[PDB]
Amino acid sequence: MLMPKKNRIAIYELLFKEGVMVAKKDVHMPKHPELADKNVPNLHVMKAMQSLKSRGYVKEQFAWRHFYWYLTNEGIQYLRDYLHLPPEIVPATLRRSR
Amino acid sequence: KKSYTTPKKNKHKRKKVKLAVLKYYKVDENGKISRLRRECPSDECGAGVFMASHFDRHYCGKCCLTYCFNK
Amino acid sequence: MAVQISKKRKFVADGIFKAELNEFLTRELAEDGYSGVEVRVTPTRTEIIILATRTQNVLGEKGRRIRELTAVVQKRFGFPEGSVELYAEKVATRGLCAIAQAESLRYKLLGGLAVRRACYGVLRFIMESGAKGCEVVVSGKLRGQRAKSMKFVDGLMIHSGDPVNYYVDTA
Amino acid sequence: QQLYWSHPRKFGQGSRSCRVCSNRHGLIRKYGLNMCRQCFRQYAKDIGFIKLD
Amino acid sequence: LRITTRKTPCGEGSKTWDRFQMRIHKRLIDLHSPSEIVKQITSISIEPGVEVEVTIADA
Amino acid sequence: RRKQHSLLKRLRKAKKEAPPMEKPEVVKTHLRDMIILPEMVGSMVGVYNGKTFNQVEIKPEMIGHYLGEFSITYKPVKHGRPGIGATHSSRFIP
Amino acid sequence: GGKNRRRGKNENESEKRELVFKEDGQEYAQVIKMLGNGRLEAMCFDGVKRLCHIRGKLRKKVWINTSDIILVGLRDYQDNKADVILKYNADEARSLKAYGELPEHAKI
RNA sequence: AGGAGUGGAGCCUGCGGCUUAAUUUGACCAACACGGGAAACCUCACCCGGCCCGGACACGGACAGGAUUGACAGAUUGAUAGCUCUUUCUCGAUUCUGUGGGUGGUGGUGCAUGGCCGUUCUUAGUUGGUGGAGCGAUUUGUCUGGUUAAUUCCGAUAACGAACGAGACUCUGGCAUGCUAACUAGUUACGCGACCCCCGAGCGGUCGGCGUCCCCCAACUUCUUAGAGGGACAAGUGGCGUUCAGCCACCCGAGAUUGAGCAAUAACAGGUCUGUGAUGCCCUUAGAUGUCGGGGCUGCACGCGCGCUACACUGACUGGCUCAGCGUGUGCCUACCCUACGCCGGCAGGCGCGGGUAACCCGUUGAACCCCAUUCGUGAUGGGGAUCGGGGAUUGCAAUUAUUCCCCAUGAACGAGGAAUUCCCAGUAAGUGCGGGUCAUAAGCUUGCGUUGAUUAAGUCCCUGCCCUUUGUACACACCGCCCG
RNA sequence: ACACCAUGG
Ligand SMILES: [Mg+2]
Ligand SMILES: [Mg+2]
Ligand SMILES: [Mg+2]
Ligand SMILES: [Mg+2]
Ligand SMILES: [Mg+2]
Ligand SMILES: [Mg+2]
Ligand SMILES: [Mg+2]
Ligand SMILES: [Mg+2]
Ligand SMILES: [Mg+2]
Ligand SMILES: [Mg+2]
Ligand SMILES: [Mg+2]
Ligand SMILES: [Mg+2]
Ligand SMILES: [Mg+2]
Ligand SMILES: [Mg+2]
Ligand SMILES: [Mg+2]
Ligand SMILES: [Mg+2]
Ligand SMILES: [Mg+2]
Ligand SMILES: [Mg+2]
Ligand SMILES: [Mg+2]
Ligand SMILES: [Mg+2]
Ligand SMILES: [Mg+2]
Ligand SMILES: [Mg+2]
Ligand SMILES: [Mg+2]
Ligand SMILES: [Mg+2]
Ligand SMILES: [Mg+2]
Ligand SMILES: [Mg+2]
Ligand SMILES: [Mg+2]
Ligand SMILES: [Mg+2]
Ligand SMILES: [Mg+2]
Ligand SMILES: [Mg+2]
Ligand SMILES: [Mg+2]
Ligand SMILES: [Mg+2]
Ligand SMILES: [Mg+2]
Ligand SMILES: [Mg+2]
Ligand SMILES: [Mg+2]
Ligand SMILES: [Mg+2]
Ligand SMILES: [Mg+2]
Ligand SMILES: [Mg+2]
Ligand SMILES: [Mg+2]
Ligand SMILES: [Mg+2]
Ligand SMILES: [Mg+2]
Ligand SMILES: [Mg+2]
Ligand SMILES: [Mg+2]
Ligand SMILES: [Mg+2]
Ligand SMILES: [Mg+2]
Ligand SMILES: [Mg+2]
């Protein structure tokens, strides 16, 4: 399998809760840190975000061994579909910035 | 950095035999069930999973590296 | 931190942080006129005064980019949530920053433009703003399969001894 | 799938690699930089090292 | 802190070296007083990049 | 000796199936650093060279030595004729 | 050898030299004696002489010195002339003689 | 002119050749202890075997009596890789099949490139505006002369006015008994007290002598530390200078020349694609050029390079005595630091129990040469310490082709080195040890530090080269040119 | 107040 559905949903919900993801480029470390740390190897995080990026949905940067992934509007919509949320909820980022 | 050499054993995968699904339960009177193979009494396997029968071995599919019995 | 690191390692680790932060924000704010970082640590908070030429594009509509950036700057350096504070800022006299000029010249040379016209333009601009002289070198495969190089100089310049470490901005 | 996907890499050149370029082969361990000998001349300023000897 | 490296990326050339160094200055001042005034005045009048650490007692 | 014990097992169970007044065939292995123990004696072992397995019959005198010590990793050299760069004088072609 | 001229691209011949066999209208020969103007006499491995010429790709690049194995291309319409396509190392020359490629006629 | 040498010897190490399954590879003044390149595994690119996909995404097919994953045992296998076979359990829409297309690469190209760096080139060199001369390329400015470390100055002047390099500059070494001010540095005093000896007046205390013995809420900043200023300017005196620019000797002095960093215009087919998530094009892409087990980079007839230890009496051995400076130190994944003091063991080492995130603990850093006293005696000797046998510990998953370390034993060449040739001007050459880098273990290397500390010079253009003017040329890929029979 | 100094993928 590419990963368990349990693992996928755990990664997607975290990305949606915050709105931005980070992982070091390393396939060996046994657990991702952060709120995936009880469960998921960061190989799954990298491999998951790669698919998500190839479908729009995400912007990707990489600087000194560390990916930085932003969620774009299409990503907000797709994740709001895929997770069956109140069709207008976003705790990701909501405040007018002075 | 050069051309390979010919292999004579190439066979990527086992072909993963395909079976008709479920005959492990027997209805044996109208409304009566019989179980041909016990469910592995391993605490984490939920007793809804069927233990294997080999020619002289009982082996648990979900106890990945345990529950093999010699008869 | 059950026992603190020694002052040697402490200052090295501070410099490493300030280096990695700048090289990161070089890659995002490139097209937004980025011209360097400036950090400041106060009791129980850490402010980062980003410094670009166009704050309207760094902030973003309702300031979404700023929150995204603060989120990663925390998530990667493991700041306890609520300790990072990222501000924006506007460079005064944008024609004196070498970095802003190199980036703008690049995004002018990237959209399709002869080299000579772009370089003349940046020279003109960073001499009108007020500077005792400037210099621009562009090198590579210019017009053919054999490499070349083009110097455009104007005004003063110095190359040797200690006044090079101020009085000269390079990129 | 595999239970043989690593063997001890806990010392020597297999353990460690540069925090920038991810290379091995000629990195600076002093003061805990952990940085490739070429990569350090590149950021030798932003850290604060200045050449004046 | 001294760090000395070959100048060249590869192995070719006459064998020149760089000599990088960073300097660290450290001083102490001692006060005999209650805590509130000192933690107050300490908290004020520091604009630039300088490290200040104040402890409970040292005598 | 974590899972070097397979060498010890397979070396037995093969000195047992050996018909009397004969020899066992060849357990063959990559384990070049195995302490020869007084139980491994009499056996027939194939030790990896780097490409071949070379057979070694175990003698009692091999006791306490290492397995790899009986299967060399190269051909012994015997020299050809010096080539066109061999001496500081040798270099010239028109 | 030994000049000022480090100007031409360095040899780099250490990468993966193969082996090369005959074709239609190609055959191996040995060098009898060299002549001026660049062209040289030859002697193929069946009897023809084929007063042979160094192709433009080999000018002052691989030195066809006297008495060594060569590969020549014939001409579709002329036979007394040929052109050097390749020179063998003594390693390739023994390799071809053993492989049953060049005849057990001529020496190195 | 000299010093120490190198080339000769044994070994360590880098390069060629040879050999091999492979001995991976770049480089040939400005390559060869260089790639920070001290490779046991890893590294690793090479050789022999073996699992994996970590082949995004789109389109098509297949599919909930079901797409697909994992796996006990027996065989097979180096292997306890469900690797493949026999078997028959499990997993539940994430996958699989086919096509388009992506991805990685210590693959190729440094003669496609960026960046960096080396070198020409350690010297004094370089360039544009308005004006002058030439049909023009070009030229003067940028110079006959004196002076300078210097295209540094004075001057002369068809040129006037400017820019860069030089210089200025930044760090460091040398001087303050003047300032600022110190239980994380001290000293002097005594408040002390205590120990010890008479060692001297005295007796033994008192007078004194030794103290890294314990104190002070004593006094201060000479020693220590580190900040602000001060000091040196060819300034004074005497000669030589067209009396200019400057040179020479001398006085007062801590010092009348400390050592580095930084560096121009124009170039080179210099080095690097094997530092890079810098990178164009080409190649390979599931039978891999993207991972594990074993071997190799160490293979030895031979040619060369940087070096280490020696050939002894200006010495070797055994005791005894007494002196430093630059530094590093618990590691953020990663998982380890420097060590006091007690005890055990001949030695390497082992156990135990404290300090240190460091002017606080190792530490007053009891360093070697040197210094003082004993044995040997011109003999390949007790000089020298290669090669080889046997045994004992530590590091590590693993020490065989012996990682390193200790002990007994073995005891080779070498008696100041042919032709040639390297470096060097004062705290320098050389002798001598000590920290940093690499580092699980670990310098015959390199980068720094002190310690004992000379002989010879104050010059020249002879040799090898460099800068400026005049002159000659059939050369301009530029004398490593061109060219005649 | 003059020994010998050839050649160049
Ligand atoms: Mg200047
Ligand atoms: Mg200067
Ligand atoms: Mg010597
Ligand atoms: Mg050694
Ligand atoms: Mg070799
Ligand atoms: Mg070569
Ligand atoms: Mg030179
Ligand atoms: Mg390398
Ligand atoms: Mg290896
Ligand atoms: Mg690619
Ligand atoms: Mg790469
Ligand atoms: Mg080049
Ligand atoms: Mg280049
Ligand atoms: Mg004119
Ligand atoms: Mg005119
Ligand atoms: Mg001129
Ligand atoms: Mg002079
Ligand atoms: Mg002038
Ligand atoms: Mg000075
Ligand atoms: Mg001083
Ligand atoms: Mg004392
Ligand atoms: Mg001062
Ligand atoms: Mg005078
Ligand atoms: Mg005096
Ligand atoms: Mg000076
Ligand atoms: Mg220059
Ligand atoms: Mg490169
Ligand atoms: Mg490339
Ligand atoms: Mg790998
Ligand atoms: Mg391997
Ligand atoms: Mg080697
Ligand atoms: Mg060298
Ligand atoms: Mg080693
Ligand atoms: Mg040393
Ligand atoms: Mg160490
Ligand atoms: Mg060491
Ligand atoms: Mg080295
Ligand atoms: Mg001159
Ligand atoms: Mg002339
Ligand atoms: Mg002329
Ligand atoms: Mg011509
Ligand atoms: Mg020519
Ligand atoms: Mg000539
Ligand atoms: Mg000549
Ligand atoms: Mg001739
Ligand atoms: Mg001729």
CA–CA dist A64, D43 (Å, integer):
13
CA–CA dist D41, D34 (Å, integer):
13
Structural domains of chain A ordered from first start? 1-98 (1.10.10.10)
Question: Which residues of the protein have their beta carbon within 7 Å of strand I?
Answer: G 2-5, 7-8, 60-61
Listed in order, strand segments (DSSP E) in chain F are 27-29, 44-48, 53-57
Question: Which residue of chain G is at minimal alpha-carbon distance from F83?
Answer: G90
Mutate one of C10, C11, C49 to test the E interface: name it (highest E CB count within 10 A): C11
Question: Is the CB of residue A10 less than 8 Å from the CB of residue A3?
Answer: no
| Residue of C8, C15, C23 with shortest CB distance to D47 | C15
Neighbouring residues of A89: CB distance < 8 A, sequence distance ≥ 6: A80
CA–CA dist C99, C155 (Å, integer):
19
Q: Among residues B57, B61, B55, which one has the least CA distance to residue B42?
A: B61
Q: Solved how?
A: cryo-EM
| Residue of C24, C63, C72 with shortest CB distance to A20 | C72
CA angle G31, G32, G34 (to 5 degrees): 85
Q: Among residues G108, G103, G97, which one has the least CA distance to residue G46?
A: G103
CA–CA dist A19, A76 (Å, integer):
9
CA–CA dist A25, D20 (Å, integer):
11
Burial of E15 (C-beta count, 10 Å sphere; 0-12/13-18/19+): exposed
Q: Which residue has the tokens 């010239």?
A: F92
CA–CA dist C39, C84 (Å, integer):
11
Give me the residues paired with residue C39 across strands.
C48
Amino acid at site E24: I
Cβ within 8 Å, pair A20-C68: yes
Give me the residues paired with residue G84 across strands.
G54, G72
CA–CA dist C38, C32 (Å, integer):
17
Cβ within 8 Å, pair C7-E24: yes
Q: Among residues A20, A18, A42, which one has the least CA distance to residue A31?
A: A42
In the structure encoding, which two tokens stand for residue D44, read together?
A: 């030798």
Resolution to 1 decimal place, in Å: 3.3
Identify the CATH number of the domain in which residue G64 sits: 2.40.50.140
Neighbouring residues of G104: CB distance < 8 A, sequence distance ≥ 6: G97
In total, the C-beta contacts within 8 angstroms joining chain A to chain D are: 7
DSSP letter for each residue of C41-105: EETTEEEEE--BS-HHHHH-TTSHHHHHHHHHHHHHHTPPTT-EEEE--B-SSGGG-HHHHHHHH
- Three-state DSSP at G82 gives strand
Can chain D be said to touch chain A, i.e. do they have 3 or more Cβ pairs within 8 angstroms? yes
Amino acid at site A87: P
Length of chain D, in residues:
53
D22–A contact, CB cutoff 8 A: yes
Helix (H) or strand (E) holding C137: strand C133-140
The alpha carbon dihedral of G1, G2, G5, G9 has a sign of positive
| Residue of C8, C40, C43 with shortest CB distance to E1 | C8
Burial of E56 (C-beta count, 10 Å sphere; 0-12/13-18/19+): exposed
**Chain E residues contacting D, CB < 8 Å?**
1, 3, 5-7, 9, 18-22
Neighbouring residues of E14: CB distance < 8 A, sequence distance ≥ 6: none
User: Checking DSSP bridges between strand B25-29 and strand C148-155, what pairing results, if any?
Assistant: unpaired
Chain A residues touching D6 at Cβ < 8 A? 28
Q: Which residues of A are annotated as a binding site for Zn(2+)?
A: 64
CA–CA dist G78, G83 (Å, integer):
12
C168 CA to H143 C1', in Å? 36
Q: Which residue has the tokens 């690699």?
A: D17
- Between the alpha carbon of residue G107 and those of residues C136, F1, G72, G86, G90, the distances in Å are 66, 61, 18, 18, 11
CA–CA dist C35, C171 (Å, integer):
11
D18 CA to H32 C1', in Å? 30
Question: Is the CB of residue F45 less than 8 Å from the CB of residue F70?
Answer: no
Q: Which residue has the tokens 């239970």?
A: D3
Q: How far is C127 from chain A (nearest CA, A)?
A: 34
Question: Which residue of chain C is at minimal alpha-carbon distance from D43?
Answer: C19
Helix (H) or strand (E) holding B34: strand B32-35
Taking a contact as any Cβ pair under 8 Å apart, which residues of chain A between 3 and 22 contact chain D?
none
Give me the residues paired with residue A56 across strands.
A54
In the structure encoding, which two tokens stand for residue C89, read together?
A: 């800022």
Helix (H) or strand (E) holding D28: strand D27-28
| Residue of A25, A28, A64 with shortest CB distance to D20 | A64
Q: Among residues A19, A74, A97, which one has the least CA distance to residue C75?
A: A19
In the structure encoding, which two tokens stand for residue A77, read together?
A: 């919509």
Neighbouring chains of E at 3+ CB pairs under 8 Å are C, D
Q: How many domains does chain G have?
A: 1
Instruction: Count Cβ atoms below 10 Å from residue C51 Cβ, excluding itself.
Output: 22
Q: Three-state secondary structure along chain E?
A: CEEEEECCCCCCCCCCEEEEECCCCCCCCCCCCCHHHHHHHHCCCCCCCCCCCCCCCCC
Domain that holds residue G97: 1-108
Q: How far is D51 from chain E (nearest CA, A)?
A: 5
Nucleotides of H under 7 A from a protein CB: 16-23, 25-31, 34-37, 41-54, 56-58, 65-73, 77-85, 87-91, 93-95, 106-119, 163-171, 183-184, 226-227, 260-272, 275-277, 287-289, 291-296, 299-304, 327-336, 357-359, 396-401, 436-441, 447-448, 478, 480
Chain D residues touching C15 at Cβ < 8 A? 46-48
- Between the alpha carbon of residue F91 and those of residues F87, G11, G62, G80, the distances in Å are 8, 16, 16, 36
Question: Is the CB of residue A96 less than 8 Å from the CB of residue C67?
Answer: no
Q: Among residues F31, F79, F24, which one has the least CA distance to residue F57?
A: F24
Question: Is the CB of residue G61 less than 8 Å from the CB of residue G29?
Answer: no
Amino acid at site F12: R
Describe the strand order of the beta sheet including G43-44 as a list of residue ranges: G43-44, G26-30, G69-73, G81-87, G51-54
Structural domains of chain D ordered from first start? 1-53 (4.10.830.10)
Q: Among residues B64, B71, B63, which one has the least CA distance to residue B39?
A: B63
CA angle C127, C132, C137 (to 5 degrees): 65
Backbone angles phi, psi at E14, to 5 degrees: -70, 150
